[PDB]
């Protein structure tokens, strides 16, 4: 994988129609909603924290997965799976491309340089706008310090600056 | 602790250098050795300069001629005789008829039990174990 | 190495009663919250064992 700065900016149209894309990669995020997901038990939670994007850009699938792991592990350890609801709010629909010389990927991929430059699929990313919610947490007011810490850890894994907004439901 | 030699080492014009072949002046089994190193604070040289040693200096040697079980083995030795004339700090100019070394342990104890021929006083003063076996000191 | 309590207390105060900044290594007072030099909060207390 290239450094994430290579795919951070929105430089072209969304590339999502998988029926026209050969070898589009499979999404490598196993779950998107963590903790207590049933709507009845979520009624106990009365606070909402959001990790909100500050800039527009593309977040790679592995960064979303890395952010999801660190925050969910922290909440499981310190808050408890029965006392919170955490949702990864964006889905990596956009397919990333790379122009590299490769074997077993088509004859055109054997031409070097910028000849036949249209890249083969290299991964997935979510295209986000300023103010967009990346992570969404529902919790009880007693755990505010722990929820803020979990979202601070998630933010350290993401390629764009974010900010934490805490509001009641 | 062990008996100490003199703390000083005055300048001596070196007589032997890397890849010099020097006879052995003891009964340790070795007869001819190749010099492959110089040991001590005086061994350091400069670009293109080949390190060399004089009487009293310790060198690293490889046995070339001698007993079959010592051949190709790496030892330490002390220069005891030198053809290259050298000036003593009192101003006396000295030269020997031939070059010679004595095989020792890294601490300076001779491997053999006797030293043949005269031994330069520089060698005996710096290495008291050599002084013990040197019959003739010059 | 044994000292009576009066001298042991003096030695502990002077040699074992401060913090080290994990960010820059600077010695800091035992009750400090930020490093004097770089103002980091990553301070580690130095601990006397046994």
């Amino acid at each position: 994988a290239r450094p994430a700065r290579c795919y951070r900016r929105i430089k072209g149209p969304p590339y999502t129609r998988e029926e026209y894309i050969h070898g589009a990669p499979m999404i490598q995020i196993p779950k998107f909603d963590m903790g207590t997901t049933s709507a009845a038990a979520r009624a106990a939670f009365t606070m909402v924290a959001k990790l909100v994007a500050e800039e527009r850009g593309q977040i790679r699938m592995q960064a979303l997965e890395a952010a999801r792991q660190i925050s969910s592990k922290y909440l499981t350890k310190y808050v408890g799976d029965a006392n919170y609801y955490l949702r990864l709010n964006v889905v990596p629909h956009h397919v990333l491309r790379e122009n590299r010389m490769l074997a077993m990927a088509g004859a055109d991929r054997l031409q070097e340089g910028m000849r036949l430059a249209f890249g083969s699929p290299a991964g997935r990313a979510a295209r986000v706008e300023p103010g967009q919610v990346i992570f969404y947490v529902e919790f009880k007011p007693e755990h505010l310090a722990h929820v803020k810490e979990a979202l601070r850890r998630a933010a350290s894994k993401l390629p764009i600056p974010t900010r934490i907004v805490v509001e009641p439901k | 602790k062990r008996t100490v030699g003199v703390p000083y080492r005055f300048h001596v014009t070196p007589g032997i250098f890397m890849n010099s072949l020097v006879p052995v002046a003891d009964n340790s089994g070795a007869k001819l050795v190749r010099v492959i190193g110089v040991v001590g604070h005086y061994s350091k040289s400069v670009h293109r300069r080949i390190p060399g040693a004089g009487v009293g200096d310790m060198v690293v040697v490889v046995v070339r001629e001698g007993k079959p079980e010592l051949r190709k083995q790496i030892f330490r030795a002390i220069v005891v005789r030198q053809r290259r004339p050298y000036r003593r700090p009192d101003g006396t100019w000295v030269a020997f008829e031939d070059n010679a070394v004595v095989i020792v342990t890294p601490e300076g104890d001779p491997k053999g039990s006797e030293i043949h021929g005269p031994v330069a006083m520089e060698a005996t003063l710096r290495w008291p174990t050599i002084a013990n076996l040197a019959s003739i000191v010059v | 190495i044994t000292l009576d309590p009066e001298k042991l207390a003096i030695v502990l105060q002077h040699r074992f009663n401060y913090k080290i900044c994990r960010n820059c290594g600077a010695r800091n007072p035992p009750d400090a919250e930020k490093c004097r030099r770089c103002r980091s909060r990553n301070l580690r207390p130095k601990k006397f064992k046994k």
Binding site: - | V6, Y8, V46, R48, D90 | -
Partner: protein, 336 residues
């Protein structure tokens, strides 16, 4: 940079290596010495030759202590210096520069001084001393102007050499002035300045060697496997990178020798009164004979075999001074 590290070839601390502006050394530094009495802080003598001597080592911690050792020695032919004038110095308040404020000359300078100086028939010394005294209260330094007496040396030339030597020994400027004035018109012998066994610095112009190549001038290597190289081997390969261009630090051929150099901490082994006891029966080669006083220095001295050499009190003496007693010179190689 370099493919293999090694120190540069030759010093750039003697740049430029030009011919000395004068054959007589011009001393920049004179030490402040506390001797308890006023005295000249230096002397000038002619280099006569070299010998070797058997000297008893008097350094108690030395490994050769008490032994007889052979030391190479330099013989200086040292006729008395003639004191011709006294000059006073002050500090210019604008910049702190040392500036001469006046000088008093002997009334009747010797006829040989007229070979180098434009002098009156008579100096009115008393007026000059009177004028000099007006600047006593702003004086910071006093020096005498001495002339050599080469007729009394083995060279036998007549034109003297003239130079300034300061008066030191006590911190009080007034006593130095009074001592300097008492010297007007008198001679100074080496024993009046130095004591045997003390250390001195020596300053002289070194022996001249003319135009020399880069191998001798800087010690650059002859190109290895010398026969292989077209266009010669006694040279550097390149004379620089592409940028900066020829730098002043690049070794180049040019004048070698005839430079002024200073060497430190040379021990005086003996100050003799009559040079016949040190002159070899063959004479000093390329010099002649010594008939008056001489100085025996341990070691070597810069300069050719007739150069005028300035000795001064040391400016970088070692921590431990040499023994107070005179060194024991058992024998000199010019003797039987």
């Amino acid at each position: 940079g370099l493919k293999i590290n090694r120190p540069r070839r030759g010093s750039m601390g003697v740049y430029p290596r030009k011919r000395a502006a004068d054959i007589v050394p011009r001393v920049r530094t004179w030490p402040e010495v506390n001797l308890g009495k006023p005295t000249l802080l230096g002397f000038a003598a002619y280099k006569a030759g070299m010998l070797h001597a058997v000297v008893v080592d008097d350094r108690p911690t030395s490994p050769l202590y008490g032994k007889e050792v052979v030391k190479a020695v330099t013989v200086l032919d040292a006729p008395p210096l003639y004191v011709a004038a006294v000059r006073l110095y002050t500090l210019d308040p604008t910049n702190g520069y040392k500036v001469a404020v006046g000088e008093a000359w002997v009334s009747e300078p010797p006829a040989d001084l007229r070979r180098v100086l434009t002098l009156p028939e008579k100096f009115d010394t008393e007026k000059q001393l009177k004028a000099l005294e007006e600047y006593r209260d702003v004086a910071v330094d006093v020096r005498v102007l001495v002339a050599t007496q080469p007729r009394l040396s083995g060279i036998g030339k007549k034109t003297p050499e003239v130079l300034e030597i300061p008066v030191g020994g006590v911190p009080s400027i007034d006593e130095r002035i009074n001592f300097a004035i008492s010297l007007l018109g008198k001679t100074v012998s080496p024993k009046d300045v130095f004591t045997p066994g003390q250390l001195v610095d020596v300053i002289a112009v070194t022996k001249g060697k003319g135009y020399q190549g880069v191998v001798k001038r800087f010690g650059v290597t002859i190109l290895p496997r010398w026969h292989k190289h077209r266009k010669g081997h006694r040279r550097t390969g390149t004379i620089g990178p592409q940028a900066p261009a020829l730098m002043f630090t690049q070794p180049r051929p040019g004048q070698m020798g005839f430079h002024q150099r200073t060497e430190y901490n040379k021990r005086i082994l003996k100050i003799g009164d009559n040079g016949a006891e040190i002159t070899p029966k063959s004479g000093f080669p390329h010099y002649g004979v010594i008939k008056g006083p001489y100085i025996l220095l341990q070691g070597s001295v810069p300069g050719a075999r007739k150069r005028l050499v300035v000795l001064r009190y040391p400016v970088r003496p070692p921590k431990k001074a040499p023994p107070a007693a005179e060194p024991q010179v058992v024998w000199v190689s010019s003797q039987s």
